[PDB]
Amino acid sequence: VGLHFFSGEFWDLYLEQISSRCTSSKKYWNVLRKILEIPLHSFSKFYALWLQRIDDIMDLKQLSQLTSKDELLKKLKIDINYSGRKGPYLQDAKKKLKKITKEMYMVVQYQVLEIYSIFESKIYINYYTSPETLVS
């Protein structure tokens, strides 16, 4: 049922249970990275959690929590073990990850906006009334 359009409460509860039970801080990143590709109705809360968790990073070594190191070295041309002045290095990391998140946000925003403005803004009843009811 995890691909439901109005499943914001389910995924908020599941991320709450991961953030409360898990102590490794790895499964939360994985599930939220999965949510950043799913066309949900209440989706911008998960993007806001993603953007404030990128802001809540502490060092470069947590970038392996996002992806693998070879995908960072090939696609973003960035190394984890690059030692030196890591201030603007981490700032450029945040800017490039914010650009990738913004592009995927445009994709998911176009999908959700299309589904809402064409289809989901018309259906007013989503429940089982009775065998005697009438639907317009």
Quick one: what does residue 9 bind among RNA, other proteins, none, with the CB cut-off 5 to 8 Å set by partner type?
Answer: other proteins
Q: Which is nearer to RNA, 84 or 131 (CB)?
A: 84
Q: Which is nearer to other proteins, 33 or 45 (CB)?
A: 45
80 contact partners, CB below 8 Å, separation of at least 6: 60, 61, 63, 64, 69, 72
Radius of gyration of the chain (CA): 19
* Contact range with RNA by CB under 7 A, out of 31-39, 58-66, 97-105, 118-126: 58-66
94 contact partners, CB below 8 Å, separation of at least 6: 54, 55, 57
CB of 6 to other proteins, least distance (A): 5
**Dist CA 22 CA 49 (whole Å):** 17
Kindly list the residues in this chain that would bind RNA in the complex (CB under 7 A): 21-24, 26-27, 55, 57-62, 64-65, 81, 83-88, 90-91
